[PDB]
Amino acid sequence: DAAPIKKVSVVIPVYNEQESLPELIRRTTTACESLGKAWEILLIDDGSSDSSAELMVKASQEADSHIISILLNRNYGQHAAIMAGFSHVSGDLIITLDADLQNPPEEIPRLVAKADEGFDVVGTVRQNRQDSLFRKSASKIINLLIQRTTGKAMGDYGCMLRAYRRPIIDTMLRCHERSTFIPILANIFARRATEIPVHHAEREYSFMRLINLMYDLVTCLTTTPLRLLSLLGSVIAIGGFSLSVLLIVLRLALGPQWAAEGVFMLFAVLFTFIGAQFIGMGLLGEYIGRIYNDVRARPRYFVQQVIYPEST
Amino acid sequence: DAAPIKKVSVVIPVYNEQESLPELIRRTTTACESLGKAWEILLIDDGSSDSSAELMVKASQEADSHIISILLNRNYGQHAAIMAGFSHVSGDLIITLDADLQNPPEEIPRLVAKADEGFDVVGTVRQNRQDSLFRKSASKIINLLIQRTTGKAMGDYGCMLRAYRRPIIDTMLRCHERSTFIPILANIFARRATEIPVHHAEREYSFMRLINLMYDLVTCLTTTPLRLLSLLGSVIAIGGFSLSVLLIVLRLALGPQWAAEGVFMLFAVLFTFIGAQFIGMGLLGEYIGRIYNDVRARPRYFVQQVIYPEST
Amino acid sequence: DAAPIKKVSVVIPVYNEQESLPELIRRTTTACESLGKAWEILLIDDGSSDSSAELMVKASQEADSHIISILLNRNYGQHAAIMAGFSHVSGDLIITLDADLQNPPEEIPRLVAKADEGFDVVGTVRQNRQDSLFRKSASKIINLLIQRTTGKAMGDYGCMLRAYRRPIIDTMLRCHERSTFIPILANIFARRATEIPVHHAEREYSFMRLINLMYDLVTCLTTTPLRLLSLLGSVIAIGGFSLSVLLIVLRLALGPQWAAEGVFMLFAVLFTFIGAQFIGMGLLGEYIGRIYNDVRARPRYFVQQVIYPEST
Amino acid sequence: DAAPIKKVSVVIPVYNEQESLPELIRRTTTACESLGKAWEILLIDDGSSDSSAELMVKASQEADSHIISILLNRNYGQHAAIMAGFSHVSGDLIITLDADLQNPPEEIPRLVAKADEGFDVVGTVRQNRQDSLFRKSASKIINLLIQRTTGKAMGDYGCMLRAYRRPIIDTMLRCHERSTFIPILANIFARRATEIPVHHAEREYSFMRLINLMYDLVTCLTTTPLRLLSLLGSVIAIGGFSLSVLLIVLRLALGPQWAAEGVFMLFAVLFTFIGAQFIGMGLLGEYIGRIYNDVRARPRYFVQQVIYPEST
Known part of the structure; x- marks a missing residue:
């Protein structure tokens, strides 16, 4: 069937984004208004210490606002913040975005249009980011491993701009595993998936983070x-x-x-x-x-x- | 007591069987009609990509049909499809069959008659299949191990044609272990069991599948x-x-x-x-x-x- | 407080005891009638194949009977049979007995009297059984280990004649561990315990059973x-x-x-x-x-x- | 917000404290009465064998008493006693104290005042206790490890005098792990924490206890x-x-x-x-x-x- 999308939910984790919050909110609101559908925006504060919570509350209380603000008692992690956001969404299409404006909000309409064609998961690939040799080799290895295991390829696993349909989020909410990766979990249940190219800000992890991430991916994927x-x-x-x-x-x-x-x-x-x-x-x-x-x-x-x- | 069977449920996993579906349905319907009891047929589509789902839906919607069609959102495995089928049966005798017509549907009456004598699990053994030396030795070893562990022998563990009574399926539905083998699980709870010889189509797994299956069986059976x-x-x-x-x-x-x-x-x-x-x-x-x-x-x-x- | 006992429940696992059932029932009934309290007897058939179930049913259906018969669908083990028996008791004092008449039923009044003094668990020790050197050394080692761990000593761990109060059985029913030992589990929760000497039939396990039992005890007791x-x-x-x-x-x-x-x-x-x-x-x-x-x-x-x- | 405290609950595990109970009760009651808020005292008897339970019951039944007595059927441990105490508190600020009077009850008002400033967890550090070299080095290592892991420092981990707010206790009640350390568990969820210096009685663990405690801390903190x-x-x-x-x-x-x-x-x-x-x-x-x-x-x-x- 051609079940179309009628409401879009945007999830954005926030952690010490006092400087980027105004422009982020403005651009996201403009992009969402260009859709022609109903929409809402969820902002999750992961225990920030730079007055971001007050800005989020002010934005939520402003007239004609579509912003829902969720406050956590302390810092728990980006994954936990995203999972908390998923528990309060109401639309049938869910989009995750980065609060640092590294990925432009203007790409959302393309993801919505692509999802309207009948895809369950829509990903993005960053073009000509010019990473180092080791990082590029690691990306290639991870892409090959994920393609072999889940049956779906992923050019960029570290990209935050992605779209999911409601059943995917509902099933992912049933997995209580503490160590995992949301994009892999989505593909584990997705029937139809695709990726599209996007651009990114030219300029803005440490080696110890890379090694731990490799171990986590290997343990999550295979034995x-x-x-x-x-x-x-x-x-x-x-x-x-x-x-x-x-x-x-x-x-x-x-x-x-x-x-x-x-x-x-x-x-x-x-x-x-x-x-x-x-x-x-x-x-x-x-x-x-x-x-x-x-x-x-x-x-x-x-x-x-x-x-x-x-x-x- | 001589509690007899009064309804028969047939479970058939389907995965890319577009060519064999018509003859399979016809022969299964004829065999079931020869029983003289109430009956139903369950077809589970494990994420097929060759129009099998449309054929199953058409068969279900046909006049005077006894076919229940269950559609999965994507491919999950034959074991998962069988478990899903068990969750929707309604009869007191459950029969599992292969959709490739490797095992003829005409043997069902023999299984029903044997089960009517008071057996909880009824198995089948393929005659003169002429397997290779290593496969035959593996079959002998597996049969001996299963006989020693569960107390019930199994000449052929890879055969799909088997019959179970409702309490066996109900208890097997209580086991949530991800890695297991249904025939062994049935014998773990069965009181009275037997096997009978059957014939099979002359002509139609890789070594990597065999090694993994051996490891799975050993881990499921003993420590x-x-x-x-x-x-x-x-x-x-x-x-x-x-x-x-x-x-x-x-x-x-x-x-x-x-x-x-x-x-x-x-x-x-x-x-x-x-x-x-x-x-x-x-x-x-x-x-x-x-x-x-x-x-x-x-x-x-x-x-x-x-x-x-x-x-x- | 001096909360006294007012009803006694007897649990006896049965497995191929066709010869000993009549005398066992007679002697147990006589011993229970000598108590002066209300009483009941539970017989659990662990998948016997020698007509024991029919005898148990006949005893239950006899006039003025205090016998409750529980039938299992197949053999599962003595521990499982005892646990099933515990799930159907109704008295405030629970006694476990062996169906082979190795431990005389005539000792029950002594256990009841001792429990009436305010003990939660009452055990028994067999006198001058004249075991081999290795078995005696193993018994000494097990007794010392249990005394050090649980704080309560046990002269004979393999003896079946023991008494428990209702709260002990209720708490033991909350432990779902598959590998354990009921007497140790009782002492893990008991406040006040004691043991008394008893006699036994002079004449009636293999080494492989002994080694497995030692491993089970060691794993259950300490790390x-x-x-x-x-x-x-x-x-x-x-x-x-x-x-x-x-x-x-x-x-x-x-x-x-x-x-x-x-x-x-x-x-x-x-x-x-x-x-x-x-x-x-x-x-x-x-x-x-x-x-x-x-x-x-x-x-x-x-x-x-x-x-x-x-x-x- | 400046949500202030309006009721204080004191938790004191008791195990063979017959000699120190009267003075402990008197001093704790005086200190609590000096607060000016509502208060209650919980005494948990961990299977004592020196008539402490009778004294606790007498204190509870005395006129105008604010003491709630909880009796356990046998000895289970100080951690289990504290957890049982947490399950019966009713105030919004929870304070743990030692029954041996090693930590004076007179410090409670300072903890209450500090918590009234907006802290979730308030700890204490003992001054000039003059421990041995190995114990001091172990304390330094543990403090550094806890600071690195949880983000909150702890000068003294073995001190019993600490204060928690109700949500911290509620979340800690959701953790069923058998091996853990309550102060670390509190900091795992605390947003704002602090410690203050206190004095202690000059005069009053074995090496085997120290080694096991080190292993427990290491296993609880990191992998x-x-x-x-x-x-x-x-x-x-x-x-x-x-x-x-x-x-x-x-x-x-x-x-x-x-x-x-x-x-x-x-x-x-x-x-x-x-x-x-x-x-x-x-x-x-x-x-x-x-x-x-x-x-x-x-x-x-x-x-x-x-x-x-x-x-x-």
């Missing part, structure tokens, strides 16, 4: 690394056993060859035991991985429609 | 592999300690014997420590295995009847 | 074995580092001493790394143990009475 | 130790591989150098494998740590206020 240990251990054990047998055969055939042959055979046995240790660790990982999946308990399926035979 | 590590480590440690003591005794008795005796004693100590490492890993596995069982939280018991003394 | 790994690793690492430093100091002081000194230093470094490995395994165990305790989620406390100040 | 294993393993593997390559290059360039060069190369390979083992253990820890966090399931966020646009 194969636990499986690779058994393969490595089996290879090592087979090599060690083959060398041990070959040493005895060679000594029995051509007699003694070196003064330290016994040491070499003992080293081969040691390598075999070391490989067995890797096999054991992989065996433990097999259970640990399933424990984790059962613990975080994502939904198994969703039913779209049920057709019963006519009663007559 | 002994975690126990074997302690035995291995104890054997290694005892051997190493015995060799270390023997070396000292021999040197003290008959004096020096080799130039590298100290190296040999150090290797023996190293082997003892390596065995201790296996013991430690087994110790960790002891807790991990119980954590997993507590996490997946299968039902502990089911009460069939309670008899109170007469009030008078 | 210290995970802590011992770090101590062992630290000792090994300190020894290795000390030897490595001593070798260098000795060589620098008195010059070269042996041809294989470098090999010895390398072995010392290897031992240090091996100790570090034990430290790491202990570090993992630290988290695993707490995960297990949080998973099995036993109750934290129970409130006996609350006194508010007089409203006036 | 970095699981991350350090991968770094250590990578360093070891890189060093071993570099040495192995250097040995071959040197031998090919300048020819043979030592009789035991092959042994050295084998040792280098062994070190590389040992480092790989550390990497694998860190890989397992990555999943274990996230499993633990998902298991103990702390609240993700709290909403303070929501402002909707004016309906007109």
Whole structure:
């Protein structure tokens, strides 16, 4: 069906944005008014300490305002702020935006139009951002891994400008896992998805953040690394056993060859035991991985429609 | 008691079966009409992309149809589709069938008749399928393991044609474990079970699927592999300690014997420590295995009847 | 307070006891009638296959019977049968008995009288059973461990004849852990406990059962074995580092001493790394143990009475 | 806002305090009466065996008493007693005090006044207690770690005299984790916190308690130790591989150098494998740590206020 969008909800986490709030609000309001549909704006203050909350309250209390302000008691994180925002939306299309104006609000109409064609998730890709070699390689690896796992590609995973339909948000609200990534979670349930190119501000994370993010993504996406240990251990054990047998055969055939042959055979046995240790660790990982999946308990399926035979 | 069957429910997962749907529906309807009992057919579309959903809807909307069509929003897996089907059945006997017509629908009456004799689970075994040596050995090993664990044998675990009674499905719906195998889960609760031989289409998984399936079955059935590590480590440690003591005794008795005796004693100590490492890993596995069982939280018991003394 | 007992409930698991059921029922009924209090008897059939269920039903339907019969759909275990029995009791004192008549039913009045003095849990100890050396040593070790952990001693943990008050059973019904031991669980919540000596039939487990039972008890009682790994690793690492430093100091002081000194230093470094490995395994165990305790989620406390100040 | 306090609740765990109860009650009552606000006192008996319960009941039943007595069926721990006390409070400011009179009750007015300035958590620091070197170093390390993790410093973590506002207690009641530390849990949710200096009685834990407390704090605060294993393993593997390559290059360039060069190369390979083992253990820890966090399931966020646009 061609179920169209009739209301748009915008979610913007706020944390120490005193300088950028006025222009952000003005541009977002103008962009939303250009849609021709009903709309609302949600501002979530993640425990700011620079008078942002007062500005948000003033904006909410202004005449003819479409802004809903949500105040958290302290800082909890951008992911938690976004999840809190999702719990108070009312429209059928949800859009996430950055409060630093790094992504222009003027792109919202394009996302709305694309979603009106029948897509559940609409993403964005930043053009010619000129990242460093390591960051570009990491982006390529992450895109390939996500495409292989979820079946949907993602050119830019760190981009904040994205659109979701209401059922996607409803299902994502059912996942209580503390460590995750919202764009991956959306694609885990999306049927139809696409991405479009966008531009960005030319000028505006540390390495320690990058390493932790890589670990989080790998743990959220797959458990194969636990499986690779058994393969490595089996290879090592087979090599060690083959060398041990070959040493005895060679000594029995051509007699003694070196003064330290016994040491070499003992080293081969040691390598075999070391490989067995890797096999054991992989065996433990097999259970640990399933424990984790059962613990975080994502939904198994969703039913779209049920057709019963006519009663007559 | 001889509680007989009065309604039969058929569950068939569908995923890109546009070509086989008409003949499948016709033959299944004919077979069900030959029963003489009330019946219904459930078709679950697992996110097909070849117009199967439209055919299913058309079949459901046709006059005098006994077909219930269930549509999923996207692909989730055959196990999830079967579980969704179980949530919408209404009969007291449940039959699972394959949509590729590899197993003929004409065998259903035999399963119904066998179940009418008082069996809770009725299975099937394919005759003279002529599998490869490795697959046959794996089948034998799996059958032996399942027989030892659940107390019920299974000649063919990969066969899809099986019948279950309503209480079995109800109890299986209480298990939320993500990784499992439905036939094993049924036997875990079944009191009386049997299998019968069937024929199959002569002509129509990859090795990577086989290895993962073996791991899944082993993890679902038992935790002994975690126990074997302690035995291995104890054997290694005892051997190493015995060799270390023997070396000292021999040197003290008959004096020096080799130039590298100290190296040999150090290797023996190293082997003892390596065995201790296996013991430690087994110790960790002891807790991990119980954590997993507590996490997946299968039902502990089911009460069939309670008899109170007469009030008078 | 001297809250006395006014009704006694007897729980007896049944599994293939066709021969012993009549005498068991007769003697238990006589013993219960000698109490002078209200009483009931619960018989749980754990999937017997020797006509025990029919005998139990006949006994329940007999005139002036105090027997409640509970039938399970199949075999699940003695622990599960006892837990099912606890879910249907109605008295304020609960007694567990063995259906093989190994423990005479005539001891019940002594347990009732002892419980009437104000004890929550009353146990029994078998006299001069003349067990083997290993079994006696295991019993002593288990008794010491339980006394140290729960604060209550248990001379015989394998004895089935025991008495519990209703609140103890109610709290034990709140623990859903699959692997546990009921007598230990009772003492975990009991305030006042005691044991008394009893006699037993002279004549009537395998080693594999004993080893598994030891592992279950150790895992249910404590997590210290995970802590011992770090101590062992630290000792090994300190020894290795000390030897490595001593070798260098000795060589620098008195010059070269042996041809294989470098090999010895390398072995010392290897031992240090091996100790570090034990430290790491202990570090993992630290988290695993707490995960297990949080998973099995036993109750934290129970409130006996609350006194508010007089409203006036 | 300047929401002031209007009722004060005092929580005091009791365990064998027969001697100190009268003076404690008298001084606490005098201090509370000096506040000028409504107040109540909660006494929790943690299974005492020295007639403390009778004294508490007598105090509760005395005329014009503000004391609520809570009796536990047996001993469960100070943390459990405090949690039980929190479940029965009614005021908007909660104060915890020690029953041994080590911390004078006369400091309560200072805490109330400080909390009236708008603080959520108010702590205390003991001056010139003259602890040993190891204990002082441990205190410094714990303070630094807590400051880095929660963002709030704590000069003395072992001090019992502290004040909390009602929402903090309400959120802490939502955390069911068995192993934790209440002051850290409070700061995890507090927005504004402070500490003040206090005095203490000059004269009145064992080393085994200190080690367990350190492990508990480390496990409750962070998971970095699981991350350090991968770094250590990578360093070891890189060093071993570099040495192995250097040995071959040197031998090919300048020819043979030592009789035991092959042994050295084998040792280098062994070190590389040992480092790989550390990497694998860190890989397992990555999943274990996230499993633990998902298991103990702390609240993700709290909403303070929501402002909707004016309906007109």
